[PDB]
Design a protein. Structure first.
Lengths: 450, 148, 300
């Protein structure tokens, strides 16, 4: 295809009205290229409309529609898909389109736009029309299953995946969807069963998801207290070997390199794994896993500033959607060395999530923030902030009442009575300093009168 | 080690008001990670660069991972593990100005380090937390590397 | 439909809630906002601009919800410390403080006659406090999980409760009986409200839809394709013609429910929009979010 693109540039340099060369470039872009082909999506497009004034074939209109769908011009893409059915006479008006390729692929594409814009009724109608034109094309059933899964109806998504498997039994995509549905529900047994069913014939970018899921199911137990027992069985060496076997084949899937970096980070080799976190960091962007791995590497190194900056970048590029647990993962890394001298601004950030959510979960961290306030109120001896912080300390003891239900209760059961006994005379110290400052201001007013 | 700054930058623009010198051009670039600004004078003859290109900077205090802070003296022959062996374009200069967003009462939020590599100028303009270890009249190395 | 006035630096921190009355009983000129900076601010909307009336300083944590009585010139605010405070809006002073602690208090709603104050708790129940004294008169037990949103009908008939597991409960407020249990949501429902005739329940949930239920026979009246993200607040215009919605995708949308079409979409907020409410005359929309601004949009 590099020589093909060279020959296409030679044909465009020898004649600028090569409709076959522009159609070939549009097809080769629509099949493979997304990043670089988009300006070429211009280049095929601008001449091709000049062809579309001369004659309206469905192939050129469908190619312009697919190029607009891939570029992100969903309006003109939908208009070209509708023109492929309304203006391209050869599709179904007075002729016949081979294999239902002209309409139903269009019935896919804008229907994917129906997936994109939350036009679920129109996308469902387009999938039903594609099923009515031909009972095959289980991928439309897979899109319907993903749409049902997006509604919070993963049983219906599993049923649509079963219908897709009824369309094609040996289909790695539906098996991967069922495996992801099981892995979301903590169903590693069924996930391994789906990977065994996929791994019979298939491999190579449809089995590497299964190896990655096996490594992920090992890492999910590595992050838990059962990881000692898994440490007895050496699951990390198996995950490292699986990651090495996956990385030996791939050269553009950075998820395997990120998994290998995480597996190195979980052992004592983390000082090299961050360098692997450098290499995936050298790779392409728009991957929250790389920033999360760099934040985790900074948190393991006790460099909380860089981990906080990485969490802030991840939230700046991801916070649009369901990332309400990443704030707690940012706040968890501020108390990894018994630190309470950097949780002053964290007191507003950790409780700054939304006006609709639960707060019972992170109460311990909230106590570990309020104790930081209980550090500063004893040092600052200025009134009108001491006793308010003592009231907030009583509120932190009311949160300790939930923290008790585990040695953190043993720590804060000392700290509650200790901080109350300190406040008993610190409020009188604050009122004494108030008296002294009022003495000073009275003396200054007397000097002004003199 | 000793690493004053570490980022990947992307050429948003080349010298806007024409070019004044025929070998060296003021390239402007932004950041992905830290979202800060750079203006830099590289010479085009031995190290060409185009618009939209992407590269990595390591502003460092010494060229050795040992952190020895040796000299300002040039020895052509030194059998030591150097940091410059990994990188394409390397310069050496002294930072001459630090400008801030500071005021009378509050501290500074944004900083602007200005440094001359023998006459080739550079402005690095971000926030005070990242522009931390820069001190005026400190010798410094540049260490660019072009990445695809 | 457009932006009439934007009030920048209305708060030093993010604004979580806004409330505006419906009747002409000195709450059709009053904005009440609760913000992240532990303050409740009362604004006076008059002469096509927004002016500050009171800065009420009683809370020690961020205010998660504010509401204005539709029968009295008083407000109430609830914050994360579970301290409910009632404010007299004719002197700007504290009526009472209900320590419903330690954390067991949430978003508030006034009844239209302003006799009862509804709130949800962490147990999964709806506590009904008396407004006349601030003491818990009764509770409503519809077991499950945390109630995120609650809303009275604006004619004194029903109470609706929305939970975090998507459970909606419809109550008769004359005997305290559970009338209906609706489950069309597996997702958290962060706002719901009854129509100005108590015929429709429009629910805003964390699934990208705006769902309409009939609360007279408990069926699905319809599904409006809302935003592409979590719809955070819905509110009816008090003549039941249009309704406004806001979402976390930095978008406000005014919806005509008779044609099921969006008549205007506001991008003036560059942050997540948490609160929306219509004017008492119905010609203005007040909206707040994380952009520290109070936006007033005009309506014909």
């Amino acid at each position: 295809r590099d020589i093909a693109k060279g020959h296409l540039k030679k044909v465009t340099e020898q004649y600028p009205d090569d409709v076959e060369a522009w159609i070939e470039l549009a097809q080769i872009l629509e099949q493979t290229d997304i990043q670089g082909a988009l300006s070429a999506y211009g280049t095929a497009t601008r001449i091709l409309q000049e062809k579309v004034q001369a004659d309206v074939p469905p192939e050129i209109l469908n190619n312009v529609g697919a190029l607009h769908f891939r570029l992100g011009n969903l309006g003109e893409a939908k208009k070209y898909f509708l023109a492929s059915l309304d203006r391209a006479k050869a599709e179904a008006e007075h002729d016949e389109h081979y294999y239902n390729a002209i309409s139903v692929t269009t019935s896919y594409n804008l229907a994917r736009l129906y997936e994109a814009m939350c036009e679920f009724h129109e996308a469902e109608k387009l999938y039903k029309n594609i099923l009515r034109e031909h009972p095959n094309y289980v991928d439309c059933y897979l899109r319907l299953g993903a749409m049902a899964r997006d509604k919070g109806n993963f049983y219906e998504a599993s049923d649509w995946f079963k219908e897709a498997l009824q369309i094609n039994q040996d289909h790695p995509d539906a098996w991967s969807l069922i495996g992801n549905l099981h892995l979301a529900k903590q169903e590693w047994g069924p996930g391994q069963k789906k990977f065994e069913r996929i791994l019979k014939q298939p491999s190579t970018q449809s089995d590497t998801y299964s190896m990655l899921a096996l490594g992920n199911v090992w890492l999910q137990t590595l992050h838990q207290p059962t990881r000692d027992r898994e440490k007895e069985k050496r699951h990390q060496d198996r995950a490292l070997a699986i990651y090495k076997q996956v990385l030996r084949n791939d050269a553009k899937n950075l998820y395997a390199a990120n998994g290998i970096g995480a597996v190195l980070a979980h052992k004592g080799y983390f000082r090299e794994a961050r360098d692997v976190f450098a290499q995936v960091r050298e790779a392409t962007a728009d991957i929250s896993d790389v920033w999360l791995n760099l934040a985790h590497i900074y948190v393991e190194q006790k460099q909380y500033i860089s981990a906080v900056q990485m969490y802030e970048n991840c939230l700046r590029k991801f916070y649009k959607h369901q990332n309400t647990e990443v704030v707690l993962y940012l706040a968890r890394a501020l108390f990894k060395c018994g630190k309470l001298q950097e949780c002053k601004q964290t007191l507003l950030k950790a409780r700054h999530v939304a006006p609709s959510d639960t707060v019972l979960m992170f109460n311990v961290a909230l106590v570990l923030q309020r104790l930081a306030t209980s550090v500063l109120k004893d040092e600052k001896s200025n009134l009108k902030e001491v006793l308010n912080a003592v009231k907030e300390l009583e509120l932190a003891h009311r949160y300790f009442s939930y923290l008790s239900k585990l040695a953190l209760a043993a720590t804060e059961a000392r700290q509650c009575s200790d901080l109350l006994s300190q406040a008993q005379y610190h409020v009188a110290r604050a009122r004494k300093q108030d008296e002294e400052e009022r003495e000073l201001r009275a003396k200054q007013e007397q000097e002004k009168e003199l | 080690a000793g690493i004053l700054f570490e980022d990947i930058f992307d050429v948003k623009d080349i010298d806007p008001e024409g070019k004044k010198f025929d070998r060296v051009s003021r390239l402007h670039c932004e950041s992905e990670s830290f979202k800060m600004d750079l203006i830099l004078d590289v010479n085009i003859q031995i190290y060409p660069v185009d618009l939209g290109d992407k590269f990595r900077l390591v502003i460092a205090s010494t060229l050795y991972e040992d952190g020895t802070l040796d000299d300002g003296e040039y020895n052509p022959t030194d059998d030591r593990p150097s940091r410059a062996d990994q990188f394409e374009y390397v310069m050496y200069g002294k930072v001459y100005r630090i400008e801030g967003d500071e005021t009378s009462t509050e501290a500074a939020t944004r900083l602007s380090a200005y440094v001359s590599y023998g006459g080739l100028l550079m402005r690095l303009q971000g926030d005070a937390n990242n522009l931390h270890g820069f001190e005026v009249d400190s010798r410094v190395y540049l260490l660019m590397k072009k990445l695809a | 439909y457009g932006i009439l006035f934007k009030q920048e630096q209305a708060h030093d921190d993010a604004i979580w809630s806004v409330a505006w009355g419906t009747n002409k009983k000195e709450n059709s000129e009053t904005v009440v906002t609760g913000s992240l900076d532990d303050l409740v601010k009362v604004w006076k909307w008059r002469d096509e601009r927004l002016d500050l009336q009171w800065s009420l300083e009683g809370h020690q944590l961020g205010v998660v919800s504010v509401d204005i009585s539709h029968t009295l010139p008083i407000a109430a605010s609830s914050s994360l410390d579970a301290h409910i405070r009632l404010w007299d809006l004719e002197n700007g002073k504290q009526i009472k403080s209900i320590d419903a602690g330690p954390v067991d208090a949430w978003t508030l709603a006034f009844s239209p006659d302003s006799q009862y104050l509804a709130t949800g708790t962490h147990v999964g129940k709806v506590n009904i406090f008396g407004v006349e004294s601030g003491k818990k008169e009764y509770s409503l037990d519809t077991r499950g999980k945390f109630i995120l949103s609650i809303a009275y009908s604006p004619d004194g008939k029903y109470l609706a409760s929305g939970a975090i597991d998507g459970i909606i409960n419809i109550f008769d407020i004359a005997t305290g009986k559970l009338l209906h249990t609706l489950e069309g949501h597996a997702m958290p429902i962060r706002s719901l409200t009854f129509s100005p005739d108590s015929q429709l329940l429009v629910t805003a949930s964390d699934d990208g839809y705006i769902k309409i239920y009939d609360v007279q026979h408990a069926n699905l009246a319809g599904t409006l394709s809302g935003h592409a993200s979590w719809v955070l607040n819905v509110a009816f215009c008090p003549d039941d013609t249009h309704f406004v919605s806001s979402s976390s995708d930095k978008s406000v949308k005014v919806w005509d429910v008779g044609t099921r079409t969006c008549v205007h979409t506001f991008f003036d907020h560059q942050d997540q929009v948490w609160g929306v409410k219509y004017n008492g005359n119905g010609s203005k929309i007040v909206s707040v979010g994380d952009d520290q601004e109070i936006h007033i949009y005009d309506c014909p």
